[PDB]
Design a protein around this ligand. Sequence first.
Ligand SMILES: *[C@@H]1O[C@H](CO)[C@@H](O)[C@H](O)[C@H]1NC(C)=O
Ligand SMILES: *[C@@H]1O[C@H](CO)[C@@H](O)[C@H](O)[C@H]1NC(C)=O
Ligand SMILES: *[C@@H]1O[C@H](CO)[C@@H](O)[C@H](O)[C@H]1NC(C)=O
Ligand SMILES: *[C@@H]1O[C@H](CO)[C@@H](O)[C@H](O)[C@H]1NC(C)=O
Ligand SMILES: *[C@@H]1O[C@H](CO)[C@@H](O)[C@H](O)[C@H]1NC(C)=O
Ligand SMILES: *[C@@H]1O[C@H](CO)[C@@H](O)[C@H](O)[C@H]1NC(C)=O
Lengths: 383, 383
Amino acid sequence: VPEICLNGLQLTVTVIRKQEEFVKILEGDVVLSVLTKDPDSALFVINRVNQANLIMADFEIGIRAISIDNASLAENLLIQEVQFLQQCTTYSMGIFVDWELYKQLESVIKDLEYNIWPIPGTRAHLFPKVAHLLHQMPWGEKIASVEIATETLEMYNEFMEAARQEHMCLMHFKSDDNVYIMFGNKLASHFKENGTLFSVPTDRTDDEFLADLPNRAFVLMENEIDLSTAVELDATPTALDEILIGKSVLPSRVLSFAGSIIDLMNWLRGSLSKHCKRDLYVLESCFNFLNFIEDWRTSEYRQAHDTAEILSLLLMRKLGTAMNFQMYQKKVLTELREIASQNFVTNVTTYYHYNRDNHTSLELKTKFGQVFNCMFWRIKMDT
Amino acid sequence: VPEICLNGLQLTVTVIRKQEEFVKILEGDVVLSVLTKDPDSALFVINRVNQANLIMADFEIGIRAISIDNASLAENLLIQEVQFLQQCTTYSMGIFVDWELYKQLESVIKDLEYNIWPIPGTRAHLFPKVAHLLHQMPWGEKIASVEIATETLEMYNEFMEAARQEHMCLMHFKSDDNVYIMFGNKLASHFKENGTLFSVPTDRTDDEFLADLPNRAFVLMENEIDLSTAVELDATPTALDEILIGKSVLPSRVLSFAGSIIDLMNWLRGSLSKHCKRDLYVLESCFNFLNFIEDWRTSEYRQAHDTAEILSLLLMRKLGTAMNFQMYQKKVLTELREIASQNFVTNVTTYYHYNRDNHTSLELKTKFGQVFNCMFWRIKMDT
Ligand SMILES: *[C@@H]1O[C@H](CO)[C@@H](O)[C@H](O)[C@H]1NC(C)=O
Ligand SMILES: *[C@@H]1O[C@H](CO)[C@@H](O)[C@H](O)[C@H]1NC(C)=O
Ligand SMILES: *[C@@H]1O[C@H](CO)[C@@H](O)[C@H](O)[C@H]1NC(C)=O
Ligand SMILES: *[C@@H]1O[C@H](CO)[C@@H](O)[C@H](O)[C@H]1NC(C)=O
Ligand SMILES: *[C@@H]1O[C@H](CO)[C@@H](O)[C@H](O)[C@H]1NC(C)=O
Ligand SMILES: *[C@@H]1O[C@H](CO)[C@@H](O)[C@H](O)[C@H]1NC(C)=O
């Protein structure tokens, strides 16, 4: 047995980081690895697979989910897991890589020659829900000038594709009113211009981010769902793991990842049907399965799933009320009071009005989509 | 014989536009079609193939080159040529589509199910030569703020990839000096800001474009090479066609198109070797060639060619002094006097200094690349 199985995976960050700080190992007979930025949402899916028995088998799928905080260390950590899963593991499946890290590391994956699959992008779940929370936001009768600050240009191309589907074309004028729709955690940090600011965070927020925003800025974020007990997840009696109690998951990082696992575990039920005998598939009676592992990327096995079909199959149907994409306004009296809420399952956007200055009637304002309906791009690189 | 062979291609623009207005038919036994915006450069390449005998055969390759001025009519014109080349032509090869029109029409080409191949992009020949003319431009010792206006975001991504390879990172400040690098014909039309302007036209210029620029604006364009006689093209005695005498070609649209024809006509010499008997390959002794026409997209037949290898093979080696990418400054005394010249064959950029106010010595200024050497993007959509 070699050295990498005894010691695990190591990083030189000039601190020698041991294995148990970054990977969250959940024990299972046929392992899997996920190279992700959000590891708490990865083990919630693989907890919900084994309690549901998607593969209707005796064994349980493990996950060795690697945390990514630095994008430059994703190339080093992809080498060490391919050097782990070939050697130390008897029944491996493959490495799932996030779509931000899949497009970065395209030269590395094709030269490594292992089963490395992409997790789909979470911006297909967020940027339609950004632009639908924009489209029915109440507003005055003044058309404003929209300047959009982004972390990359792929976030600009996926936003205005989603703005075009909601029939909004956002134009910039030489107008006194301004609108700044910012995409990223580090971008809206003590900004000084006088327009209304729509901060869209692209990762998990911390206590630096809610303090460094300007006053009366809008925050377009999703709710982290706090996991405490297993009876809050489903009325069907399951068990939540002890590594997951007290942790929080993201609904974009769950539902993008659980769209690919149900495409993979329904492949695995057919691959244990022809190769293994039962009505539970016992691994002592299973021989030579996982032969052609790249065949689930072929479209006869990869299907698109509805969000209410994912939550019903994976025995987590009580999380549909807690899966929201909300808009928060930071008003220092510092308290981020709530403006909007768009649910993930049934997309019913709900706007919250607080009756300030004691009125018995409220005139309904015109929406932002009816004002900002219907070309060259001026791009400034700044730091 | 059907109706489309007798009448040809027709357009409803509400004027009936006939076949002779936009299709320039050059007569040949084994035809080809090119759906391009610049049809004068496409006819020059297929003239230079038949005088060189790349396929060493007695027949000549014809071209039925389609002119594109409207991008919305490219989807209609792609249907009518697939409906032409199957029916009216005995020996067809395929439709070449420009890379601006290939990425626009990706849904239409895969449903038409014919041999439709992309012409490679001309911005691989221009945007390195934009950024190399920038990098050794003389300049003062003030770092300026760069705001870049583009027609699409694909022109911004291909420019700052080419700016990164020349080690220039262009940052925007809140500085009093400004730099406006504009990409497009319609963009720099009577602009009013006080910074220095670098207009980069993406198509052929006309007399509206040289009048509507601001004073002391910089024009980054390539020279159209005026075709008059055949002795100016090569010292080897060839003949220039009568449709091409008095027309002008573009060196980006020639060399992107002639990179793919030498990959195709060297395929055709092997496909007439195994299928046809000779040492000149007579078409009356040729039977059942052009069988597997998609095999030249496979990389055993598609090779990269140097620009001095293209001009030596195609018998146009006297054009290499006339293939330049130049920088012009419009100075109204209206006269676009010349600043720079970068050759296409041997990339020796040459900067022209005019000794105004009668000095006997000139201090050499610091270059633009040494000033502007070494991040979020703010994007404004404007019209
Ligand atoms: C990430 O890795 C790079 C590798 O060059 C290193 O310079 C950097 O300090 C690391 N951390 C962050 C926070 O960027
Ligand atoms: C919610 O929106 C998605 C697209 O974002 C759509 O596929 C889905 O049907 C909607 N859910 C409903 C109507 O329950
Ligand atoms: C509204 O009523 C509450 C309850 O008395 C009071 O505190 C508040 O000042 C009132 N506001 C106005 C504008 O009268
Ligand atoms: C191009 O075609 C479209 C088709 O809708 C038409 O509206 C337009 O007038 C044409 N011409 C130009 C110059 O855009
Ligand atoms: C000119 O530049 C191209 C790249 O743009 C390069 O491939 C070529 O070798 C250069 N030509 C020379 C050195 O003659
Ligand atoms: C430079 O010399 C020429 C030739 O006489 C003359 O026209 C011009 O005015 C001179 N310029 C200056 C600044 O003396």
